[PDB]
Amino acid sequence: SSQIRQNYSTDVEAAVNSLVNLYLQASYTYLSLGFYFDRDDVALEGVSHFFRELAEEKREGYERLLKMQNQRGGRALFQDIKKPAEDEWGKTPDAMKAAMALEKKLNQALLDLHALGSARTDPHLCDFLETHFLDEEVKLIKKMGDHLTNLHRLGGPEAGLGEYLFERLTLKH
Amino acid sequence: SSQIRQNYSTDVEAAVNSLVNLYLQASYTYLSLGFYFDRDDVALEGVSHFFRELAEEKREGYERLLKMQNQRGGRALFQDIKKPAEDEWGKTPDAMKAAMALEKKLNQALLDLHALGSARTDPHLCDFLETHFLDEEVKLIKKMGDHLTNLHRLGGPEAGLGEYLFERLTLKH
Amino acid sequence: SSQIRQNYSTDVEAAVNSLVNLYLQASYTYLSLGFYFDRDDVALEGVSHFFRELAEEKREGYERLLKMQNQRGGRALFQDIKKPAEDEWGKTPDAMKAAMALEKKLNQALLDLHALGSARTDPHLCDFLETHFLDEEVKLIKKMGDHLTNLHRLGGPEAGLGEYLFERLTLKH
Amino acid sequence: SSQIRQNYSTDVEAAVNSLVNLYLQASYTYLSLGFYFDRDDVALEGVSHFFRELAEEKREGYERLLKMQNQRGGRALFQDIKKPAEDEWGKTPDAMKAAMALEKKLNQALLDLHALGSARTDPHLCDFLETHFLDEEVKLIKKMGDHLTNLHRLGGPEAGLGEYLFERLTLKH
Amino acid sequence: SSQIRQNYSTDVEAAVNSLVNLYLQASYTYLSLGFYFDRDDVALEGVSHFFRELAEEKREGYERLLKMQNQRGGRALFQDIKKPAEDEWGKTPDAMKAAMALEKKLNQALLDLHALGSARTDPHLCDFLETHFLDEEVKLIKKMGDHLTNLHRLGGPEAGLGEYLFERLTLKH
Amino acid sequence: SSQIRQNYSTDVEAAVNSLVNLYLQASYTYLSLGFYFDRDDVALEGVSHFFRELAEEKREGYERLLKMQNQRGGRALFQDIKKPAEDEWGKTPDAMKAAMALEKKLNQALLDLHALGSARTDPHLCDFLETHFLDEEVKLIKKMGDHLTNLHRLGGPEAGLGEYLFERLTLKH
């Protein structure tokens, strides 16, 4: 019986906790991707930095969701965080594809949450998602798409050379 | 037959004028709360300042609603402003509870207006409420909730001491 | 039995509360005048700004009266605030005449309060009114008089042109 | 089969391309209005500048729509741009009325697009329109309304004098 | 019967309006080229920026022609703007070739206009074209020629790698 | 068969991965503690900030371990992250005791790792632990001990008052 709770569905509260777990798992996957590219037998600093930055971005994501949960009077409930799907992530193209699939999953979860909020007529939740999540995802997915396109353009018999050039000329280091 | 009016329901126009009266009444209640705590036999400067600041916040609220009314081609209609519910507001906890109830009433009025706008398919009104009102209310109610919790933690046989400490260590002065 | 009260008549206390209501009502009238001139079918920004500034001036007026009430040990008592006399205020000359009548009413109320204080031999009240109210009113009424004179000079068959020029060349925008 | 496309209706994609053509046509109309008032036999610099600035505003509009189209995975499709409705635009009042009608058409197209997005449950599109278009239109239409009101106030037997004063005292030059 | 018109042929006036339409169409083609390279499945930022900058350059071109038309007493006449020749522009080399052909067309139109002005003994028109157009075109065509040469040097079995390197090392981003 | 691996036991490699999981779990517990104290019915900002800062500290811990793992040629292996032991953490004293027990567990794990490294004669590992972990833990545990002592000193019948004062006067906010 939270003293501040108003127009906040128990369904949305539960969905927010689920989304928090999804972001914790996503941040975890990027942590893994980040250090994989830091291995001496992979060594692509720009790629490592790219994923480590995304791990931080997802952390800000669940921290923002957690803050909002408390602002609305909801109660945070944490569950085990599932380990990443892979121990090794292949080459840059393979890793970027995995990252892309992860973002699409996150984006669908955000869209599902927004639809749920809309169904429960919760304009504050809608505004929150639109302001801090929806466009951020679209921009990120667009960026990954651009990266995949350039990596594919740099593929072929000399993909190794291409992978090196991409990390050196497109990614920050 | 306003030359600029477009997709602005007469129902929303009326609801906006009603909301303006609600904010005028809210600002009035905070003016009363502000000076009550300025009385020599109450003397809690931090509490007085807290409510006087909220009176200013509600004023900005109705001024923004009034500006929007004109931007949409609506016409402002003013009614008598009902005096505050109390002449004396008790102790800090009692006043904060009254303030909390007032904000919840304001917030429900905002949610009702948003639902009305949604029913009349008025995206500009929705955007306006989400940008300048909805989150402001949630943050304020959360803050009042935190205050009530600390005041309750400082209650008991030495509530007087607690009330003094709260005004001195939590509220601005 | 206020511990600080000294030489403060219950009559003056009551008159101060009445004056506070008069100023709240005056500020309300200027709020209405301000937004009326902000209407798309009136659109005289300089005039709107002129009245909105006066609304702020009257607010400072009742806030000062309220502060003084507490300094003297009096107790603020609020009543309903009567809505403005008009929903639409006509043209600049009509609005300025209404504003002038309002200020003369306020000024007479201040003079009546001063006479009451003088009759109850309350020099602090007298000093308060002379320092923060009496000259402010005289200057404002003089200014409105000057405005009415120029508006009358700009009247006639081309009053519309005159009204535009006055707002553009005399009023701030 | 865009690799980044997610929750983006082919209907919205098509409507966005249509809206882009509408903005290209609007920018074109303002280009025409801008130079018409630059003619030696019209010569109203402030009016010319007003419309030339709007031409730039509409350009930013279609460029933003185009950028969003690509962010969502949609594909830009361009069509012929219809020439302006008039070769000569009359006097300031006539031109401002045409501009007003154009903005109302643009605004209705934006509202129609928003309704379409809402029907296809596309919160990103909604957020995009609310953030960069809806309020911009309302403010602009309000401004044009104010201009028409002042121009009408300056009309009559000495409309020429009025038109000159308006360009000199209200419009930037 | 323009009061300022002097030594300005109706033929040149007409040719200037035609050239304005040609530049509007050119700017339109570059807008299309610009966003095509912004597609997630093309993603060559440097190329996108190159063409978007040219779209701005052509806009300045027709705006300058329009200004001159009015300075000479001529009257601007706008026609429909034909859509770009292609919806998709292929790879960087294909797009640059299209851009080159477009510039050569523009340049021939400028040379034709200059010859017309020379035939009508209009030294002001000649000076105008030489000062703001002729050398700008020559420099641009030279630059595109250099680009095509480098792109051809980077062609072959690993053209994809070449295209990426060109965008990264020659074009601005 | 890492090309850089030298004097790095597979046992230490495994223990480092285990320790990384322990730190991930610790950071998770502090995230939970942090937001629990952010609840409107707990509301102790200084306490919330204290734990949120520790969550960041543990993150830096596992990131440093991960970096070292790669520097030595080891391979990071991630496992599920167990959720925190409690959903609600009681009062400040209860939470600080839990935090203290957690740090002692972490410290014992560090001491066990150091003993393992010593047994495998790995001076680099020893130096790493001494430089970035051992003293940091001792200082933190000392600090928590001091906090528990002051909280106990502030206990009794007016523990609520004590808890408020501690958060206000000892913890940062």
Which string of DSSP letters, residue by residue, matches B79-141? --BPPPS-S---SHHHHHHHHHHHHHHHHHHHHHHHHHHHHTT-HHHHHHHIIIIIHHHHHHH
Whether A154 and chain E come into contact, CB under 8 Å, resolves to: yes
Contact C66, B30 (CB under 8 A): no
Q: Does D141 touch chain B (CB under 8 A)?
A: yes
Look at E40 and D4 and tell me if their CB atoms are within 8 Å.
yes
Q: Which of residues 7-46 of A touch F (CB under 8 A)?
A: 24, 28, 31-32, 35-36, 38-41
How far is A1 from chain D, CA to nearest CA, in Å? 31
Listed in sequence order, the DSSP H helices in F72-134 are 92-119, 123-129
What is the DSSP code string of D116-158?
HHHHTT-HHHHHHHIIIIIHHHHHHHHHHHHHHHHHHHT-STT
Judge contact between A137 and A124, C-beta under 8 A. Answer: no
How close is the nearest chain B Cα to the Cα of C103, in Å? 20
Which of B51, B33, B57 shows the shortest CA–CA distance to B171? B51
Method: X-ray
Question: Which residue type occupies D53?
Answer: E
Q: Identify the closest residue of chain D to E41 by CA–CA distance.
A: D2
Chain D contact for E66 (CB, 8 A cutoff) = yes
Alpha-carbon Rg for chain A, nearest whole angstrom, is 18
List CB contacts of B163: < 8 A, sequence separation 6 or more.
B44, B91, B92, B93, B151, B154
Neighbours of E (≥3 Cβ pairs closer than 8 A)?
Answer: A, D
How many separate helices (H) and strands (E) can be counted in chain C? 6, 0
**Which residues in chain D touch residue A126, judged by CB atoms under 8 angstroms apart?**
123
**Chain E: nearest CA to D46, how far in angstroms?**
16
Asked if A104 is an interface residue toward chain D (Cβ–Cβ < 8 A), one would say yes
Q: Which of E43, E161, E168 sits opposite A149 (nearest CB)?
A: E43
Spatial contact of A167 and A44, defined as CB atoms under 8 Å apart: yes
Strand partners, B81: C81
Chain A contact set for F80 (CB, 8 A): 80-83
Residue of C nearest to B72 (CA): C40
Q: How far is CA C24 from the centre of its chain?
A: 9
Residue C81 and residue B28: Cβ atoms within 8 Å? yes
| Inter-chain CB proximity B3 and D135 less than 8 Å | no
CB contact under 8 A, A123 and B130: yes
Q: Is B155 on the interface with F (CB under 8 A)?
A: yes
Of E35, D125, E41, the closest CA to residue A138 belongs to D125
Q: Answer whether E7's CB lies under 8 Å from E122's CB.
A: yes
CA distance D127 to D121: 12
* Any D CB within 8 A of A118 CB: yes
| Residues in contact with D120: Cβ distance below 8 Å, sequence separation at least 6, in sequence order | D9, D11, D12
CB within 8 A of A1, min separation 6: which ones?
none
CA–CA separation, E55 vs E59, rounded Å?
Answer: 6
Structure tokens at F56: 């960041």
DSSP chain E: --SS--S--HHHHHHHHHHHHHHHHHHHHHHHHHHHTTSTTT--HHHHHHHHHHHHHHHHHHHHHHHHHHHTT-------BPPPS-S---SHHHHHHHHHHHHHHHHHHHHHHHHHHHHTT-HHHHHHHIIIIIHHHHHHHHHHHHHHHHHHHT-STTHHHHHHHHHHHTS--
Cα-Cα end-to-end distance for chain E: 51
- List, as own/partner pairs, every contact residues F85-90 make where C-beta atoms lie below 8 angstroms and the sequence separation is at least 24, other chains included: F85/F29, F86/F32, F87/A77, F87/A78, F87/F32, F88/F36, F89/F32, F89/F33, F89/F36, F89/F37
3-state secondary structure of F85: coil
Own/partner contacts of B163-166, CB < 8 Å, gap of 24 or more, are B163/B44, B163/B91, B163/B92, B163/B93, B164/B44, B165/F161, B165/F164, B165/F165, B166/B92, B166/F164
The phi and psi torsions of D81 (rounded to 5 degrees) equal: -100, 115
| Contact criterion met (CB below 8 Å) for E67 and E20 | no
Structure token pair of residue D45: 């610099």
Q: Are D102 and D29 in contact (CB under 8 A)?
A: yes
Residue B77 is nearest to which of C28, C39, C87, comparing CB atoms?
C87
C-beta atoms surrounding E122 within 10 Å: 19
Residue E86 annotated as binding site = no
- For chain F, how far is it from start to end, CA to CA, in angstroms? 51
Contact assignment for A155 to E160 by CB distance below 8 Å: yes
d(CA F99, CA F94): 9
Say whether C167 sits in a helix, a strand or coil: helix
Write the secondary structure of D70-126 as one string of H (helix), E (strand) and C (coil).
HHCCCCCCCCCECCCCCCCCCCHHHHHHHHHHHHHHHHHHHHHHHHHHHHCCCHHHH
Asked if D95 and D147 touch (Cβ cutoff 8 Å), the reply is no
Instruction: Report which secondary-structure segment, H or E, holds C160.
Output: helix C159-169
Cα distance from N-terminal residue to C-terminal residue, chain D? 51
Nearest CB partner across the interface for A32, out of F2, F78, F87? F78
What one-letter code names the amino acid at B120?
R
A–F interface: beta-carbon pairs under 8 A: 72
Nearest to A33 by CA among A74, A80, A93: A93
Residues with Cβ within 8 Å of residue B88, at least 6 apart in sequence = B36
Q: Does D138 touch chain C (CB under 8 A)?
A: no
Q: Is E136 annotated as a binding residue?
A: no
Q: How far apart are CA C101 and CA C99, in angstroms?
A: 6
**Structure letter (DSSP) for residue A133:** I
| Cα three-residue angle F132-F135-F141, rounded to 5 degrees | 125
Q: Which of A73, A53, A66 is nearest to A24 (CA)?
A: A66
Question: D142 vs C42: CB contact, 8 Å cut-off?
Answer: no
Using a CB–CB cutoff of 8 Å, tell me whether A142 touches chain F.
no
Residue among F93, C31, C81, E74 nearest B32 (CA): C81
Query: Which residue of chain B has the CA closest to C37?
Result: B70
Helix (H) or strand (E) holding C121: none
Distance, CA of E13 to CA of F147 (rounded, Å): 87
Q: What is the resolution of this structure in A?
A: 1.9
Distance CA F70, CA F66 (A): 7
Integer Cα distance of E155 and D72 in angstroms? 32
Cα separations in angstroms, A117 against E165, F93, F112, F143: 47, 38, 49, 44
- CB atoms B142 and A70 under 8 Å: yes
Distance CA A88, CA F172 (A): 42
Of the candidates C62, C64, C98, C67, which has an alpha carbon nearest to the alpha carbon of residue C79? C62
Binding residue per annotation — A63?
yes
Kindly report the number of other CB atoms within 10 A of residue C53's CB atom: 12
CA distance E33 to E36: 5
What stretch of H or E contains A119?
helix A92-119
Among D159, C43, B153, C18, CA closest to F40: B153
Residue in E72, E155, E142 with CA at minimum distance from that of residue E104: E142
Which residues from B are below 8 Å from F43, CB to CB? 145-147, 149-150
Q: Which domains does chain F have, with CATH numbers?
A: 1-173 (1.20.1260.10)
Question: Among partner residues A6, A123, A128, which is closest to B126 by beta-carbon distance?
Answer: A123
Assign D51 to helix, strand or coil.
helix
Q: Which helix H or strand E contains B32, and what residues bound it? A: helix B10-36
How is residue A59 annotated by DSSP? H
CA of residue A164 relative to chain centroid, distance = 25
Strand partners, D81: E81
Nearest residue to A129 via CA among A27, A53, A61, A58: A61
Please tell me the distance from the alpha carbon of residue C101 to that of residue C144, in angstroms, as a whole number: 10
Q: How long a stretch of residues is chain D?
A: 173
Q: Within 13 A of D117's CA, how many CA atoms are on the CB side? A: 20
Q: Are B85 and B98 in contact (CB under 8 A)?
A: yes
How many inter-chain contacts (D to E, CB under 8 Å) are there?
Answer: 72
How far CA F5 is from CA of A149, F13, F70, F120, in Å, comes to 36, 11, 10, 15
